[PDB]
Symmetry: none
Subunit: 306 residues, 6 copies
């Protein structure tokens, strides 16, 4: 029994904050897609158009988080992929199908459930035209969107599109949130995306403010997360670095107030652990624990356990 | 083989207006396949390959025509963009061929009967990198075989309407006076234009054109959303005032036929969001729900 | 076995009409270039001079065609390049392109020919950058052929020699190109200078008939596989020539005229059942009356 | 045995004056860098992030001296390079690896020690492609070229192990920061510095991300400059006192004169750099007719520095 | 060691005017060699090497001052043009060429080669205001510090000459106040000004001693033709001398020669090319006559229509 | 006994035509140069300034001929050198010009110092470079032979020179090249330190019919040698009569194209011959005047 767009959006409120309009578009785009799979590709003599999605929002806005939750709420296999690891290769054409084998991997090799799966491509704005090779993916990955079958699987392309806020202004001529609503297929064309690619992404969603939980994940989940990197730098000191949740959240908030987004996470953490790293090799303690009082107030020093 | 008349008649079911352009495409396509069957050489004389160059605004139907031509002739069809090649791309030029074989079941013969449509040709017009493609992709036109495959190059040619005037009414009347030398000054090399003998010109679609595009085509937008609403147990009815409203919205945005979908989605957005959570008979879309996207669609229980 | 300038020019008469002087020059220049490659750069203690070619003629005179034809008649790799496009590291791009069509064979690529279009357009940096190639750093073996219209060249020559443009282009000198905009070190790398005349009214008519690939023969063969005989009257062929000159398109604009004159006919041709179709003058110049239809 | 950040900072106090915050940052950055090379790129299943440095401070604030000192204090091969020498050439991306051969040169061609070396690129702010102070296409190419080094790629030496320190005045950076933080002094503003501020300045996102650690330098104050003329083992006063010393004459710099030299330096904004050019023009006349006299000592008062009207006192 | 006074004094015999410049050079030169003899380190303190940067119009006496200094200290002297260095990496090995030429004029004596002087002309030319041009500033920089001759350039004194046409402007854009002559503007020169001109900081820091020359005036030019031990008039009076003919230059004729030199803006460099065009006809048919002396008047210089006076 | 400037100019009239002003300058310069070597570098307490020469004129004006002639008229060793063929290893190739001067001097150090050196195409190394200073080392003077004594003469066309002078002086090229100044050569691409070494400057205005004849024969890259080798690989021997070569010179002077317009003349006269050459079977082809001037008659064909 498929969840109505009302239900889909409802459970999305539990994992992501704000972004109500985008969550309305995704709820509809997702519903229609699976509502088309169950019934069939052809419906009453008419062929239904595949409605793939394009997420446009700043880094750490929750683009990745949204694509993940949609899969969990529909108990459907989910896999990620970076468009940057695809650029500059003709052999990556055999690496574009790699994203498919990973889908089957987390799908127990079930062909049918795999076709119901969702694929999220991060940083699509990066491949927009090296220019020839970068585009090579736009057209290589393009073969997937159609389906050779990848026709059934839903595609979600996320991107920050920094320069997108400028091209739209040169055409529509409020705030970035107001300008990103005026987005058009021709706007992405001037950005660096090919017409045949954009035509495959009918559904276009836009995010506004950053997501506290999104940023918090960027400081933890990634294999190269700041916290992980520092924990390892403190580790070769014979010192265990622990980040308390309150602290992480504190950090995210600071990054939003400064509108620096994920890009400004390090500058914060660095000033937070600056004093500690300086006089750390001059002490003898088991671990250092970072609290919220240390991050927000910047008043109290990080705790120390001997 | 279907006569040029038949080809033009089947194109009337998928594309609207552009009658002159479809007359040229019908003859060019007919002569091309008429040549392949007979042979490259005919009665001691060598026949000239007649490739096509579509020149029309964005959303005029340049791409649709191409796709339709292939379907009406049960011939493999592949698309490609010129901006993709500009600036190691010589080995990416042959990529368009492997894609043609992919949709051709790897049959060498049927692949030669295939049609290739390169979009945004006007973009590569120089700068050394753009020209390098006009000469690299040029190696395909002749054939090295890519000699048998039909090439259809499409483009908007924004600055073309200006150079023609500097040499020679409306843009449609000015695009009829187009000459090989006009594309030269535009940015295309002599050797390239000479490979594109046939030149078709498309006009700027009006209101009634867009309206029929939303209705007539077997894959019309309305038919699609009606089918989507249909598997919900609901009937979708687009009032005439509503469809004309969509067309106008499209014209105001200059997006042509391509902007049609983005318009239809916005209007039906709220509706499809709370459709499966109701229990009615049919939904009626009117002009008040499109032009301003203000009032909600009509719900009959 | 190298083809004599006689033979070379003779096979040029099969692809290009007129320009008999241009083709006599290209023949000797090309013959001597490869004759030097086979024998060697140094010959009998004397170092032979590399003879590169400079093609000067109106747009659509046959410059590009002459270059291409030279390559085919010598089974030698050929590659074009636009001087307007030119970038120092892009000058070597013309080379890799020559290797692409040469199957990456170093020896056959050195036997190759390169045509640089619109040299009159260039700026100076290119004249000196592309200069490094002419010498060779190897690009010493490859034959270079620089084409150009040189609109203002007809004037500078007149301000010195003080007939027709054909007569003046024959008085062309290295110093004339100097005043034009070319550097002394660049022109000195192009010893051979070939001039092409303007395809006249009679020349254009011949281009429509004489060539093995003339337009009339191409359309007569197209109408031929339809069971129809296509006939072009002389008054009609002259009409097309006049249409091309008024447009200053030259021979490049010949096809565009014939196509528009045979558009309506080819459209409703497979729908008829006649013996032959005759193209008269009224159908070309006027474009009002339809071609004659004999059943 | 690696020196602690305390130790490193401590020894930096023996060559560079003030900039305490900047030295604390450099001390941690440098420590971490070599603490990583010894342990290994990967540590306990986690990959350590390379911590290159970006020096932001006015001309003659101590950027060059700090870089050089760090290397001496760690017996490590040091080499410099101007970012201005990279622009205007297409093959200059090969002149970038030239900085590597110069590293091996001062390192005795030892592959291992060379990887432990430190590189300092001056005037990075000058290669930024922006509308501020209007070649952009060639300048940006450098940021992306030198970039390949930061990551790491016939020396065979990998540039992944060598520490990079990119210095630059960043004149207009004071401004862009103020157009963001708005709702104090430049020192207070350069503390508010953010990777996005440099972006608007003219640096590409891929380059800034390679420079995680950012150390800022304040404008050497009066008292700072005065100390520079006295305290340093090779201070100007101690140099001129040495030149006058081998003439049988004692040179005395009244504090009134030293602060006067500082002010002259501040007004010109030349920082510590413009120090020697001031002292020379003051002592030019005296040193000309010095070997032609016979007195005990020459006393330099303020009136010789500021006014430059009066001549130094001569004690017979 | 000659005192700065002596050094400047003997410079007066070779160069006219530029008294301030010679004062700067004298002091710098004195200190440099005063340093070499004593040693790099003196009394626990390291002395600062004081290299020179000459700044003045073309033909003001830059090159002459450099050369003269060497003769006044019997020291090996060699020139070089900064333009010969620009646009080359192989010129990094041509930078060391300047040293081998010094050793050449020094009989391959490593010590006396280290005491030598090197004058680099047209430094203002290599100012990137680029990559190849700057490549010299940093390459030639390596020398100024000091590094198979085995000679160290640390000891050798460097003198970088140049016109710096644009420097005149940048100095006015700084010293200006709200809303004098170039001589007065060139005195205000500061290390920061050269920075904006196109010289790298690390290079200017190696040229502490900065000297400035003024533009030679009429009376100045007039003296250059007479006073210098190798003045032109003295050279030609010797050429005519070995012909048994006395050459006399009227004051009115010398002043005329000065004016011609200014109108052409060639400074002192353009003097010779003026004297030669006047005495050309006369030197031609001189070994074919038999007179006592020749007298060059103004009418022969300015007008160039009338021939020199011949006395029998 | 040294020849007076009068005598020197008179014997130059026998080998070169026109260029009377230049020859007057060369006569004085050379006279004084050798008048200084005999007397001594220092004279009556005053050091005499070395007067090196800079020939400025069109290609084939007689720059090279004048130089050679001066040496013969003074029985003095003469050697040429191209500035083009002149790198860091070429710094040791610059001294090569010296060993060549000793070779033709029987390795006599004294007579070698009395020798004359002519450097061709100086206008070709002007940066607009390292050779200017590498060769500069010679002009001053450093085999053990000092180059301080040898007289230097640097010839060059200086194509762009005509322009730079016009942008300052603001007649014919002959009147413009008379206004030449040391600063003009500066902007052209010559370094100050080099121009200062060439005090005596001589300009030329007329082409030499004989000089052009030489260019067609003497040079290792002469047109005749280039075409004779082209005909040679055809099994044919190309012969240029003296009256045909001269015929070429005049044609080139009538068009004022100098030596740059010698190729386009020789081609137009051997164009027909080269066309139907690979289609014959003869021994040699003789080019006569009628073949050049008249252009009517074809070259003689010996079977």
């Amino acid at each position: 029994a498929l969840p109505t767009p009302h239900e889909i959006r409802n459970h999305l409120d539990d994992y992501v904050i704000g972004q109500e309009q985008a969550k309305k578009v995704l709820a509809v785009a997702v519903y229609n897609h699976y509502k088309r799979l169950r019934n069939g590709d052809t419906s009453n003599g008419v062929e239904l158009g595949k409605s793939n999605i394009l997420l446009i929002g700043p880094t750490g806005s929750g683009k990745t988080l949204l694509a993940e939750t949609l899969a969990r709420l529909l108990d459907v296999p989910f896999t990620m992929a970076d468009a940057t690891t695809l650029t500059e290769a003709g052999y990556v054409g055999e690496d574009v199908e790699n994203i498919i084998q990973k889908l089957l991997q987390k799908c127990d090799y079930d062909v049918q459930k795999a076709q119901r799966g969702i694929v999220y491509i991060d940083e699509i704005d990066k491949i927009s035209r090296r220019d020839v090779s970068g585009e090579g993916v736009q057209q290589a990955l393009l073969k997937l969107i159609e389906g050779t079958d990848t026709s059934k699987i839903l595609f979600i392309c996320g991107g920050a599109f920094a320069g997108l806020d400028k091209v739209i202004s040169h055409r529509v001529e409020a705030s970035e949130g107001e300008l990103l609503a005026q987005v058009e297929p021709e706007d992405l064309i001037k950005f660096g995306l090919i017409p045949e690619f954009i035509g495959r992404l009918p559904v276009v969603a836009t995010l506004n403010e950053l997501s506290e939980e999104a940023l918090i994940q960027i400081l933890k989940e990634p294999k190269n997360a700041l916290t992980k990197q520092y924990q390892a730098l403190f580790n070769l000191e014979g010192v265990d670095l622990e980040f308390r949740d309150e602290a992480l959240d504190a950090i995210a908030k600071k990054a939003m107030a400064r509108k620096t987004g994920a890009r400004g996470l390090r500058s914060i953490v660095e000033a937070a652990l600056l004093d500690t790293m300086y006089d750390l090799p001059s002490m003898e303690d088991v671990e250092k624990v970072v609290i919220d009082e240390s991050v927000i107030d910047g008043q109290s020093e990080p705790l120390l356990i001997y």
